[PDB]
Write a protein that binds this ligand. Structure first.
Ligand SMILES: O=C(O)C(F)(F)C(F)(F)C(F)(F)C(F)(F)C(F)(F)C(F)(F)C(F)(F)F
Ligand SMILES: O=C(O)C(F)(F)C(F)(F)C(F)(F)C(F)(F)C(F)(F)C(F)(F)C(F)(F)F
Ligand code: NA
Ligand code: NA
Lengths: 116, 116, 116, 116
């Protein structure tokens, strides 16, 4: 998969299920164009966002809707969302896993980048 | 001091010094309007961004220029920048500290919200 | 798998490969008895540490040999190891994933606990 | 102050107050000998653990009693405690800050090592 997102919940010790994720790509005019979106599964994973053909070079923003997640669980969190902004595929195609660990007042994120 | 930003470096075990930080406030048309900015000090801290009178309820974005930080140290980084997006809420404690811990492919951020 | 360990490298944006992991279990006399050990694979994962029969209730310590990992890469890190100490299976069998994200002067760890 | 410990709470967005912290030094027979201890203050900090004269090179372990902390707040935690194990090295900067960020199923820790 060229782009996968994985989200965990640090309060419950579980995957973070039904988290909305929106991906944007910076356009020539420097605006953020919608690129792909989806929801995490029961495993906390979101697959199928894009394809090798469509996932060209660019600056991408992965927005994880953490506030919506916490509020659906009846919790008032600090952040609106968790963002991950990065240049992709600038040395040719790579596979990216963007992982996030959520708490009500904190988040951590990391990337795993592999060459197929 | 209603808003302070603190940035640490997980590779060197040090404050992250001379990191550019930009704060934006979300406007009525949903655009991000410049609000305050500065560079972290030799302690990794950025004080004096705003005043109680200026820092009204609303949605704010703190952008930390991590890419330039890593490049000035000769290190190849993943992210363009780190973002922290949150709502200021008068009901909650009145001082906000936004802390971030930087690594080349990862960052962690937390909020410490307290009262005097 | 009743117990799995997954380790990532925040400097490289990769799995942390060939990381030694030692698991101990607290004995009746309050000493730490060796329980299982192994090394992470090319995916950063360590499977096969134990079995459902052997992984009884107890207090377990998962020691991840982070210093040995960094030193093998020619880096002088801060910590000797990363530890994770927890009571397991006290409400019946669970499956535990212990994840760690490594930097030279920092680490983060989380647990995912599921009921089979 | 050669050694300071700071503890934050990622659920409440606050310092972690009145957390017990024990520091041990590794002895010649590889056992852990009590070295210093205290409880974090209303700022989440524990100062005054040791002096320059007492804090010689060696391996130290900082145990943070996270389980009792979460229980006093009515929250079910995963870990027995959090540990930070490191070597003090006279070559490196002379002040050590050990920071930890707590969630029920996760913790992050970093070291900030600086000179006056
Ligand atoms: O030095 C401080 O006063 C501090 F703000 F507490 C801190 F040490 F920076 C910290 F916030 F604890 C921290 F180290 F940055 C952290 F542990 F919280 C972190 F690294 F986990 C995260 F990234 F969340 F800030
Ligand atoms: O299980 C996975 O494959 C995973 F979710 F991707 C993960 F490796 F666990 C992870 F999310 F990356 C993570 F490592 F657990 C993390 F994000 F939580 C972390 F790396 F930040 C921390 F340090 F917490 F482990
Ligand atoms: Na290129
Ligand atoms: Na029981």
């Amino acid at each position: 998969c060229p782009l996968m997102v994985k989200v965990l919940d640090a309060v419950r010790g579980s995957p973070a299920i039904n988290v909305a994720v929106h991906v944007f790509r910076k356009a020539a005019d420097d605006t953020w164009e919608p690129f792909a979106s989806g929801k995490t599964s029961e495993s906390g994973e979101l697959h199928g966002l894009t394809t090798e053909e469509e996932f060209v070079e660019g600056i991408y923003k992965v927005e994880i809707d953490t506030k919506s997640y916490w509020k659906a669980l009846g919790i008032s969190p600090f952040h609106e969302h968790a963002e991950v902004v990065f240049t992709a595929n600038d040395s040719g195609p790579r596979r990216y896993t963007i992982a996030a660990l959520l708490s009500p007042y904190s988040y951590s994120t990391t990337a795993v980048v592999t060459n197929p």
